[PDB]
């Protein structure tokens, strides 16, 4: 049900899950609230890399929890 | 036919959880009033966090993520799995945390869980009273 | 056996095996290994010429138009060479012949004819319907291109395709190090 | 748990308070396994301690704040200097090294992961670490791990308590 990682263990997969969704919450909360880009792009500046790629683990890192659940309750 | 409603063991596990939060917020309530923190916002019990959330810089933002990660890490070890049902492997609230082993036999088990009960109930309703006298300024004397 | 019997895990030193896979990529996503083993050899082909190329413009610079070819250094190059187009790579329409200073440059040719031999070439062995085997661990990084020179011994054969590996990869970490070094200090050959 | 590796010289088994008379094999297992931990830590915090005072890297820690290694001052006023960011991308290399690469080969002894002799397996990526054969090789070894683990741990504590005293981690000298 994993795809590709279902050779992944249990304990990395966790890893991964949990570094994604600190990465994630951290450029999320950084973008919208802590250091908003709103206004440097109405300026005219270009936004934070970062921010941008780095909210994307979040979604991935709830679903690489899912797939850590899965592969541990599996005996991987 | 779906279990839409939870078994006696989540609410007793819901209860004891209660219990416990309750118990360290009256006496952080009490003791926010009282004494601080260096490089934390200085603020009212019903306000604390939202100035920690609000203005997270220094050493609040670090505590407060130290906070939320210990509190999800404990959630996510400490699931009640399946006690919904009722079919828990482990007694509802029994997280294993007695680092001093001060209660070990049956009748000391029986009777501190009734005293912690007890006294967990009692933070609960005393909580729930400063939160209501506070945001109903006449529902409760004392607040 | 490890990687599925790919070259270039094998250790300098005879009987012992380096197979160097500390993240257990292999295992974890072996399906992919024709395809990692050809990601390699490209990489290591491209990174043999950059090397080369990064060097030999010291010595010798083609006079074409000095908007690039008067280039102070390699690290100044590509951004000299690639033009100032509005979009990365968009030809500029209503100026063609680059008045306005904003058209691509020989990079953009020079990318464009890539972009047909990798079409024409990987994705063709890989991707074609009527090549059905198409990329397989044993014929990874083979386009037959010179295949005529290498030894007919099999044992040979598997020597020289060692051989490529390797300095493909040692011409990957020169590159890397040489580009880095003539950012940092914008020096000749010794810093690249 | 007399036997044990831990008994030497100086002191034999040395269990004052008796936390080990309930003679628990798991919670020896745990006891002994948080102790190399800690060791290896302490030592780690020890050099940490001891190298910045003479060197610090060049560079940048944080180029988005201009904080260069050499602004922030080593010892324990390093933790609000350097960014809670660094602190958590430390955090995060620690618990990839304790989840993944790190594992109990056996649980009959603790704080073995198969690194081989001073822990070298994971000097470099891409190697398998090898136990030293003698047996009494391997019994020294794994005691001079522990003593200085001890050692080490018991001198963070005193560099702490010096650079409470004094601002800097050697503020006397
Ligand atoms: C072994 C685990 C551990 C470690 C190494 C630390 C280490 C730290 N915590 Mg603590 N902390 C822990 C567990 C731990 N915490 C737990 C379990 C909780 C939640 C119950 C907290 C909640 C917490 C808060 C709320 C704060 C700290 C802070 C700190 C720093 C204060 C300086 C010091 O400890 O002296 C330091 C980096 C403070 C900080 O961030 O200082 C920079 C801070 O504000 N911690
Ligand atoms: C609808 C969303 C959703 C779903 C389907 C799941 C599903 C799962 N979570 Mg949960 N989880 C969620 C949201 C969700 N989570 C959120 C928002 C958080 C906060 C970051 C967490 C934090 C979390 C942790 C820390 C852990 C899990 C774990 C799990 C797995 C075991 C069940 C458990 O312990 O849940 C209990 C926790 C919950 C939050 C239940 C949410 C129920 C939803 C609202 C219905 C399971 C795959 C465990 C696991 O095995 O992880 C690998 C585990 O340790 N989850
Ligand atoms: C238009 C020109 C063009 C085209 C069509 C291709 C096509 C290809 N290249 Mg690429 N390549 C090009 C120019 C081009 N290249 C140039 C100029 C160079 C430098 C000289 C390279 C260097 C290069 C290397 C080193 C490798 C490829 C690989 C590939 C293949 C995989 C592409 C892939 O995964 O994309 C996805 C790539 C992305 C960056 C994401 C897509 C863009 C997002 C959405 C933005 C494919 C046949 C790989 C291959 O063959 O693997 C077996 C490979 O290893 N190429
Ligand atoms: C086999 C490859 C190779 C070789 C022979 C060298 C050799 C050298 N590098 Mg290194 N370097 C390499 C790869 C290599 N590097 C790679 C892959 C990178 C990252 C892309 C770097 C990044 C790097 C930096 C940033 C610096 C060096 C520097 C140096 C010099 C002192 C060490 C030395 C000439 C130092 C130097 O003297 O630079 C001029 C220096 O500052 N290197
Ligand atoms: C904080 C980490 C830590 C931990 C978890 C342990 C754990 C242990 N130590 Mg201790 N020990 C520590 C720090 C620690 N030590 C330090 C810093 C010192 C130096 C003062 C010592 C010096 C020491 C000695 C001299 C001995 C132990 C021994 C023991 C065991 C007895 C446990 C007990 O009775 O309680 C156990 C493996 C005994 C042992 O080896 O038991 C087999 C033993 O002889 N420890
Ligand atoms: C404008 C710009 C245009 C750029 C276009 C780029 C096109 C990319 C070409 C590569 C795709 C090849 C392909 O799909 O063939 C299918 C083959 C499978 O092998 C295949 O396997 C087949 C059998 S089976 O599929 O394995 O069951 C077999 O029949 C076949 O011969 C064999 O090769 O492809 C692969 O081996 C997997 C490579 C996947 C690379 C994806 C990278 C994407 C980025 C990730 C971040
Ligand atoms: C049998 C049973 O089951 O019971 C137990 C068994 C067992 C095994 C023991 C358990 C445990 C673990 C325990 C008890 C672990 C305890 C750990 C402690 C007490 C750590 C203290 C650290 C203090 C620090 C860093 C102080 C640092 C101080 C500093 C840096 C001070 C610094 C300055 O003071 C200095 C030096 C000068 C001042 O002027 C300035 C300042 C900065 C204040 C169990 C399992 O849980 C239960
Ligand atoms: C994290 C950092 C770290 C430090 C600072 C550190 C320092 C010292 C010192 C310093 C005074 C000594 C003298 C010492 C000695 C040995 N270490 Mg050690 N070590 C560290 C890490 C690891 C890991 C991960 C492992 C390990 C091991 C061994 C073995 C066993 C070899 C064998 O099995 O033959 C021996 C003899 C392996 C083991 O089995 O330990 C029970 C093992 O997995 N170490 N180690
Ligand atoms: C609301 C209000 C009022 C009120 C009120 C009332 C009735 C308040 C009641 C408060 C009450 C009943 C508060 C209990 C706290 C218990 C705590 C903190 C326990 C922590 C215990 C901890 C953290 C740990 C315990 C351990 O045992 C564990 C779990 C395992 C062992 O191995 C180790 C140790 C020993 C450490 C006024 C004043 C009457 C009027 C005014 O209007 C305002
Ligand atoms: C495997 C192994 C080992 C190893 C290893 C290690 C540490 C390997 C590290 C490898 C590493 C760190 C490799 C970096 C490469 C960087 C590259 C290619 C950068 C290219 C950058 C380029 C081409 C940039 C170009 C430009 O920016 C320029 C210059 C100017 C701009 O105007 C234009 C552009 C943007 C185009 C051990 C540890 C020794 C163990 C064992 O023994 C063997
Ligand atoms: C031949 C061959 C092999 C090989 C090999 C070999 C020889 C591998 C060699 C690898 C090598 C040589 C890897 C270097 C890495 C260097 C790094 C990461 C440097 C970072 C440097 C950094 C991040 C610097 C940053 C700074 O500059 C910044 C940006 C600002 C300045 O103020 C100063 C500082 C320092 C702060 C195998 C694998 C063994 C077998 C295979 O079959 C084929």
Redesign the pocket.
């Known amino acids: 049900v994993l795809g590709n990682l279902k050779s992944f263990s249990s304990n990395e997969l966790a890893f991964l899950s949990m570094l994604f969704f600190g990465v994630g919450l951290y450029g999320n909360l950084q973008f919208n609230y802590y250091d908003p880009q709103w206004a440097k792009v109405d300026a005219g500046g270009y936004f934070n890399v970062s921010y941008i790629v780095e909210s994307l683990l979040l979604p991935i890192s709830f679903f690489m929890h899912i797939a850590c659940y899965i592969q541990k309750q599996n005996g991987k | 036919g779906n279990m839409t409603y939870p078994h006696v063991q989540w609410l007793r596990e819901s209860e004891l959880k209660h219990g416990r939060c309750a118990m360290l917020a009256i006496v952080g309530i009490f003791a926010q009033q009282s004494f601080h923190?260096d490089?934390?916002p200085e603020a009212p019990w019903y306000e604390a966090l939202k100035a920690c959330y609000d203005n997270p810089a220094?050493?609040?933002?670090?505590?407060?993520?130290?906070?939320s990660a210990?509190?999800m890490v404990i959630e996510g070890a400490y699931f009640p799995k399946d006690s919904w049902i009722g079919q828990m492997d482990r007694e509802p609230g029994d997280l294993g945390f007695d680092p001093l082993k001060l209660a070990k036999d049956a009748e000391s088990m029986k009777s501190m869980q009734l005293k912690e009960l007890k006294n967990g109930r009692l933070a609960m309703m005393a909580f729930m009273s400063c939160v209501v006298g506070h945001y109903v300024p006449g529902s409760v004397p004392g607040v | 056996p490890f990687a599925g019997g790919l070259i270039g895990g094998e250790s300098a030193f005879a009987g012992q095996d380096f197979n160097f896979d500390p993240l257990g990529l292999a295992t974890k996503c072996e399906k992919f290994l024709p395809w990692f083993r050809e990601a390699e050899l490209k990489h290591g082909r491209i990174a043999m010429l950059a090397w080369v190329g990064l060097v030999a413009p010291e010595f010798v610079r083609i006079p074409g138009p000095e908007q690039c070819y008067g280039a102070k250094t390699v690290v100044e190059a590509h951004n000299a060479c690639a033009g100032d187009p509005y979009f990365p790579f968009i030809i500029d329409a209503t100026d063609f012949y680059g008045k306005d200073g904003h058209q691509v440059g020989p990079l953009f040719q020079v990318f464009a004819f890539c972009g047909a031999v990798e079409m024409l070439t990987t994705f063709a062995k890989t991707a074609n319907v009527s090549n059905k085997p198409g990329l397989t661990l044993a014929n990874a990084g083979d386009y037959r291109l010179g295949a005529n020179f290498l030894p007919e011994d099999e044992a040979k054969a598997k020597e020289m395709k060692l051989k490529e590996l390797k300095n493909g990869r040692l011409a990957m970490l020169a590159f890397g190090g040489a580009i880095t070094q003539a950012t940092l200090t914008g020096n000749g050959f010794p810093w690249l | 748990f007399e036997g044990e590796l831990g008994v030497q010289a100086p002191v034999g088994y040395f269990d004052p308070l008796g936390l080990s008379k309930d003679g628990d094999v798991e919670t020896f297992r745990r006891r002994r396994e948080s102790e190399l931990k800690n060791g290896r830590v302490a030592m780690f915090a020890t050099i940490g301690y001891m190298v910045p005072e003479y060197f610090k890297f060049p560079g940048y820690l944080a180029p988005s704040a201009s904080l260069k290694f050499a602004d922030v001052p080593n010892g324990?006023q390093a933790?609000?200097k350097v960014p809670?960011e660094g602190?958590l991308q430390w955090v995060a290399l620690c618990g990839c090294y304790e989840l993944c690469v790190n594992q109990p080969v056996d649980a009959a002894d603790p704080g073995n992961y198969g690194k081989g002799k001073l822990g070298y397996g994971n000097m470099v990526l891409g190697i398998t670490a090898e136990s030293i054969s003698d047996p009494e090789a391997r019994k020294r070894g794994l005691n001079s791990e522990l003593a200085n683990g001890r050692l080490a741990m018991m001198a963070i504590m005193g560099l702490w308590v010096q650079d409470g005293l004094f601002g800097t981690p050697y503020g006397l000298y």
């Open positions: 923190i490089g934390y220094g050493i609040v933002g670090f505590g407060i993520a130290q906070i210990f509190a | 324990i933790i609000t809670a602190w």
